[PDB]
């Protein structure tokens, strides 16, 4: 009965990383954000896949970050890659103490580079400890 979530990205969304409604024991998906049903320790994780065709002239940075909106806002986890056909994953994860009704966003800078070749390989989840 411990809160758990695992949302996957909508491949058919336009210029957005958008999460599709596992969402169990009180975790909600609202406003593209995971809402935590109770205070406690949560493992938070995500994976986004990026792909591109060759290397252009403007230098490509790929960013991915998980943020906590404490209903204050702050970056929990963030990573950046500089890919310059190329393929890059960015993973994030850790344990955090969260408050009831906190909201969690997992965001990127370049939705156009998203790689939906493998289904459900772009995800975001939490598991309460």
Ligand X SMILES: Cc1cc2occ(CN(C)CCN(C)Cc3cn(-c4cccc(C(F)(F)F)c4)c4ccccc34)c(=O)c2cc1C
Among 86, 101, 109, 110, binds a second copy (CB under 8 A): 86
Closest CA to 109 of 87, 69, 83, 80: 80
105 binds, among a second copy, ligand X, none (CB under 5 to 8 A by kind): none
**Residue recorded with tokens 């890919």:** 83
**DSSP β-ladder status, 103-108 and 33-35:** antiparallel
Stretch that binds a second copy, among 13-21, 30-38, 86-94, 105-113 (CB under 8 A): 86-94
21 binds a second copy (CB under 8 A): no
24 binds, among ligand X, a second copy, none (CB under 5 to 8 A by kind): a second copy
**Residue recorded with tokens 């591109």:** 52
Among 16, 21, 61, 71, binds a second copy (CB under 8 A): 61
100 binds a second copy (CB under 8 A): no
Among 38, 76, 109, 111, binds a second copy (CB under 8 A): 76
Tokens matching residue 66: 């998980």
94 binds a second copy (CB under 8 A): yes
Among 17, 65, 104, 105, binds a second copy (CB under 8 A): 65
123 binds a second copy (CB under 8 A): yes
DSSP string, 39-84: SEEEEEEEEEEEEESS--SS---EEEEEEEE---EEEEEEEEE---
**Residue recorded with tokens 């939490």:** 126
């Amino acid at each position: 009965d411990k809160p758990v979530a695992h949302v996957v990205a909508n491949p058919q969304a336009e210029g957005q990383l958008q999460w599709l409604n596992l969402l169990a024991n009180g975790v909600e998906l609202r406003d593209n954000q995971l809402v935590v049903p109770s205070e406690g320790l949560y493992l938070i994780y995500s994976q986004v896949l990026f792909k591109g065709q060759g290397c252009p002239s403007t230098h490509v940075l790929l960013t991915h970050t998980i943020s906590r909106i404490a209903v204050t806002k702050v970056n929990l986890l963030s990573a950046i890659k500089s890919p310059c056909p190329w393929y890059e994953p960015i993973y994030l994860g850790g344990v955090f103490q969260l408050e009831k009704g906190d909201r969690l966003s997992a965001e990127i800078n370049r939705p156009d580079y998203l790689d939906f070749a493998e289904s459900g390989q772009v995800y975001f989840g939490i598991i309460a400890l």
